[PDB]
Protein backbone atom coordinates (compact mmCIF):
# COMPACT_ATOMS: atom_id res chain seq x y z
CA UNK A 1 0.00 0.00 0.00
CA UNK A 2 1.55 3.28 -1.17
CA UNK A 3 0.44 6.58 0.38
CA UNK A 4 1.45 10.18 -0.17
CA UNK A 5 1.78 12.03 3.10
CA UNK A 6 0.85 15.67 2.59
CA UNK A 7 -2.93 15.39 2.84
CA UNK A 8 -4.81 15.21 6.13
CA UNK A 9 -6.59 12.16 4.71
CA UNK A 10 -3.16 10.70 3.94
CA UNK A 11 -2.29 10.68 7.64
CA UNK A 12 -5.49 8.79 8.48
CA UNK A 13 -4.93 6.36 5.61
CA UNK A 14 -1.30 5.80 6.67
CA UNK A 15 -2.30 4.83 10.21
CA UNK A 16 -4.97 2.39 9.02
CA UNK A 17 -2.64 0.87 6.41
CA UNK A 18 0.14 0.44 8.98
CA UNK A 19 -2.22 -1.03 11.58
CA UNK A 20 -3.62 -3.51 9.06
CA UNK A 21 -0.16 -4.39 7.71
CA UNK A 22 1.46 -5.10 11.09
CA UNK A 23 -1.07 -7.90 11.62
CA UNK A 24 -0.87 -9.46 8.13
CA UNK A 25 2.71 -9.01 6.91
CA UNK A 26 1.58 -6.42 4.35
CA UNK A 27 4.03 -3.81 3.04
CA UNK A 28 3.42 -0.07 3.47
CA UNK A 29 5.32 2.69 1.68
CA UNK A 30 4.88 6.35 2.66
CA UNK A 31 6.25 8.88 0.18
CA UNK A 32 7.55 12.42 0.78
CA UNK A 33 7.48 12.03 4.56
CA UNK A 34 9.94 14.93 4.84
CA UNK A 35 6.92 17.17 4.16
CA UNK A 36 5.48 16.24 7.60
CA UNK A 37 8.36 16.41 10.11
CA UNK A 38 6.00 16.74 13.07
CA UNK A 39 3.96 13.67 12.13
CA UNK A 40 7.21 11.75 11.55
CA UNK A 41 8.16 12.10 15.23
CA UNK A 42 4.82 10.57 16.23
CA UNK A 43 5.34 7.72 13.75
CA UNK A 44 8.71 6.91 15.33
CA UNK A 45 7.05 6.59 18.75
CA UNK A 46 4.30 4.43 17.22
CA UNK A 47 6.79 2.05 15.60
CA UNK A 48 8.80 1.66 18.81
CA UNK A 49 5.89 0.12 20.75
CA UNK A 50 4.92 -2.43 18.13
CA UNK A 51 5.73 -6.08 17.35
CA UNK A 52 4.46 -6.57 13.79
CA UNK A 53 4.28 -9.64 11.59
CA UNK A 54 7.66 -11.06 10.59
CA UNK A 55 6.99 -10.19 6.93
CA UNK A 56 5.79 -6.62 7.60
CA UNK A 57 7.95 -3.88 6.11
CA UNK A 58 7.50 -0.11 6.28
CA UNK A 59 9.17 2.01 3.59
CA UNK A 60 9.56 5.76 4.07
CA UNK A 61 10.46 7.89 1.06
CA UNK A 62 11.93 11.32 1.72
CA UNK A 63 14.34 13.82 0.27
CA UNK A 64 17.62 14.41 2.08
CA UNK A 65 16.26 17.15 4.32
CA UNK A 66 17.48 18.48 7.69
CA UNK A 67 13.81 18.67 8.76
CA UNK A 68 13.68 14.87 9.10
CA UNK A 69 13.82 14.05 12.84
CA UNK A 70 16.99 12.50 14.22
CA UNK A 71 14.98 10.02 16.30
CA UNK A 72 13.33 8.60 13.18
CA UNK A 73 16.71 8.33 11.43
CA UNK A 74 18.21 6.34 14.31
CA UNK A 75 15.22 3.98 14.46
CA UNK A 76 15.34 3.12 10.75
CA UNK A 77 18.00 1.96 8.32
CA UNK A 78 19.02 4.66 5.85
CA UNK A 79 19.57 4.06 2.13
CA UNK A 80 20.88 6.96 0.07
CA UNK A 81 19.78 7.18 -3.57
CA UNK A 82 21.87 9.47 -5.75
CA UNK A 83 23.48 9.58 -9.20
CA UNK A 84 25.67 6.53 -9.75
CA UNK A 85 29.35 7.27 -9.08
CA UNK A 86 30.44 6.76 -12.69
CA UNK A 87 29.74 5.51 -16.19
CA UNK A 88 30.31 1.86 -15.26
CA UNK A 89 28.06 2.10 -12.20
CA UNK A 90 25.43 4.04 -14.15
CA UNK A 91 25.18 1.40 -16.87
CA UNK A 92 25.11 -1.53 -14.44
CA UNK A 93 22.22 0.12 -12.60
CA UNK A 94 20.37 0.56 -15.90
CA UNK A 95 20.75 -3.07 -16.98
CA UNK A 96 19.57 -4.32 -13.59
CA UNK A 97 16.49 -2.07 -13.59
CA UNK A 98 15.25 -3.22 -17.02
CA UNK A 99 13.90 -6.81 -17.07
CA UNK A 100 15.87 -9.27 -19.19
CA UNK A 101 12.81 -10.33 -21.21
CA UNK A 102 12.38 -6.67 -22.16
CA UNK A 103 15.76 -6.58 -23.96
CA UNK A 104 15.60 -10.14 -25.32
CA UNK A 105 12.48 -9.78 -27.49
CA UNK A 106 12.22 -11.13 -31.05
CA UNK A 107 14.37 -8.50 -32.84
CA UNK A 108 17.95 -9.42 -31.97
CA UNK A 109 19.06 -5.83 -32.67
CA UNK A 110 16.99 -4.63 -29.70
CA UNK A 111 19.81 -5.55 -27.31
CA UNK A 112 22.31 -3.22 -29.00
CA UNK A 113 19.79 -0.36 -28.98
CA UNK A 114 19.34 -0.75 -25.22
CA UNK A 115 23.11 -0.76 -24.78
CA UNK A 116 23.38 2.45 -26.81
CA UNK A 117 20.59 3.95 -24.71
CA UNK A 118 22.35 2.83 -21.52
CA UNK A 119 25.65 4.31 -22.70
CA UNK A 120 23.92 7.52 -23.80
CA UNK A 121 22.07 7.77 -20.49
CA UNK A 122 25.30 7.25 -18.55
CA UNK A 123 27.26 9.87 -20.52
CA UNK A 124 24.50 12.47 -20.23
CA UNK A 125 24.04 11.93 -16.49
CA UNK A 126 27.80 11.86 -15.73
CA UNK A 127 28.29 15.25 -17.51
CA UNK A 128 26.00 16.80 -14.82
CA UNK A 129 28.87 16.15 -12.33
CA UNK A 130 30.81 18.82 -14.31
CA UNK A 131 28.07 21.33 -13.33
CA UNK A 132 29.04 24.03 -15.93
CA UNK A 133 31.13 22.34 -18.69
CA UNK A 134 29.12 19.07 -19.08
CA UNK A 135 25.87 21.07 -19.37
CA UNK A 136 25.17 24.83 -18.99
CA UNK A 137 22.53 23.89 -16.35
CA UNK A 138 21.85 21.07 -13.85
CA UNK A 139 19.14 19.29 -15.80
CA UNK A 140 17.22 16.47 -14.12
CA UNK A 141 17.98 13.72 -16.60
CA UNK A 142 16.69 10.71 -14.70
CA UNK A 143 14.89 7.38 -14.65
CA UNK A 144 11.72 8.81 -16.20
CA UNK A 145 13.70 9.98 -19.24
Amino acid sequence: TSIAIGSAEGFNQADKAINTAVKSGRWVMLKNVHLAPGWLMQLEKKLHSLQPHACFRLFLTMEINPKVPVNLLRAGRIFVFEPPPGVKANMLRTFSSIPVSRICKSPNERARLYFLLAWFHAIIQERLRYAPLGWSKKYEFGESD
Partner: protein, 48 residues
Protein backbone atom coordinates in the same frame (compact mmCIF):
# COMPACT_ATOMS: atom_id res chain seq x y z
CA UNK B 1 24.39 10.00 9.42
CA UNK B 2 22.48 8.97 12.54
CA UNK B 3 23.31 5.52 13.92
CA UNK B 4 22.05 3.91 17.10
CA UNK B 5 23.94 1.38 19.19
CA UNK B 6 21.46 -1.31 18.11
CA UNK B 7 22.46 -0.72 14.48
CA UNK B 8 26.08 -1.55 15.29
CA UNK B 9 25.00 -4.47 17.49
CA UNK B 10 23.02 -5.82 14.53
CA UNK B 11 26.21 -5.57 12.47
CA UNK B 12 28.19 -7.32 15.21
CA UNK B 13 25.55 -10.05 15.51
CA UNK B 14 25.64 -10.55 11.73
CA UNK B 15 29.42 -11.07 11.72
CA UNK B 16 29.25 -13.51 14.64
CA UNK B 17 26.21 -15.61 13.71
CA UNK B 18 25.29 -15.00 10.04
CA UNK B 19 28.76 -15.15 8.50
CA UNK B 20 29.14 -17.44 5.46
CA UNK B 21 32.92 -17.46 5.96
CA UNK B 22 32.62 -19.43 9.24
CA UNK B 23 30.59 -22.35 7.86
CA UNK B 24 33.30 -25.00 8.09
CA UNK B 25 36.00 -23.21 10.07
CA UNK B 26 36.81 -24.86 13.40
CA UNK B 27 40.08 -23.27 14.55
CA UNK B 28 39.34 -20.50 17.05
CA UNK B 29 42.25 -18.33 15.90
CA UNK B 30 41.22 -18.53 12.24
CA UNK B 31 37.57 -17.84 13.10
CA UNK B 32 38.70 -14.76 15.02
CA UNK B 33 40.60 -13.45 11.99
CA UNK B 34 37.52 -14.04 9.82
CA UNK B 35 35.30 -12.29 12.38
CA UNK B 36 37.73 -9.38 12.69
CA UNK B 37 38.02 -8.98 8.91
CA UNK B 38 34.30 -9.36 8.29
CA UNK B 39 33.40 -6.90 11.06
CA UNK B 40 35.13 -4.08 9.17
CA UNK B 41 33.54 -5.15 5.87
CA UNK B 42 29.93 -5.32 7.08
CA UNK B 43 30.36 -2.08 9.02
CA UNK B 44 31.39 -0.29 5.83
CA UNK B 45 28.73 -1.99 3.70
CA UNK B 46 25.73 -1.15 5.89
CA UNK B 47 26.84 2.35 6.91
CA UNK B 48 27.93 3.47 3.42
Amino acid sequence: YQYSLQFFLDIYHNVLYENPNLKGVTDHTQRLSIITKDLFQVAFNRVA
